[model samples]
Target: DVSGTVCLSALPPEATDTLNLIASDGPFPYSQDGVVFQNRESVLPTQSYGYYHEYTVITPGARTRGTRRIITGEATQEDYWTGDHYATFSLIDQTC
Candidate 1:
């Protein structure tokens, strides 16, 4: 999974630290570009389907969708993939 040069340059110092902590803690804090949930009980109180994910389009929030080839140093040739729920998204980045 770490084969490519994932770009975290757009993230603020605090935000990057937050992601590091969340990743180390386990899976409850699952996220694409935002806080998804804190625990299973709090996944979606209105739904009775145990826990799952749903994708819906709102007003097209800031940096909703896009792609890019982030150039990191001109020497090492590494590539990163980013996308989200809209199909063909490996992960989501704010560059949209």
Candidate 2:
């Protein structure tokens, strides 16, 4: 039950789509969507290598990878999200 403080209701609608994609093993929108997140900002609780991975959250008008992301732990069910690259993170409450 270790999770962060963000509320699912407060997140953008795009997050819902991203969440669905994650749960479905994804037909993700980008090639970079399922890459390993290095956690360089150290904002998330530390874990061993391969414990964290990242997925992209498409910005409405952006043509790039965009800064928004969803990061999941080894369990896949435990996840976090970042709206500003790796600068900060909020634990995603999947139970909602």
Using lDDT, give the best candidate's number: 2
> lDDT by residue for model 2 over 11-61, one digit each (tens)?
887888888998898989998777887776566668877788888888899
Where model 1 places Cα greater than 4 Å from the true spot, the runs are 1-7, 26-96
Distance from true position, residue 12, model 2, in Å?
Answer: 0.6
Candidate 1 CA-lDDT value: 0.29
The candidate that achieves the highest TM-score relative to the unseen native structure: 2
Model 1 Cα displacement at 30 (Å)?
16
lDDT of 1 at 29: 26
lDDT of the candidates, in the order given = 0.29, 0.78
TM-score of each: 0.24, 0.84
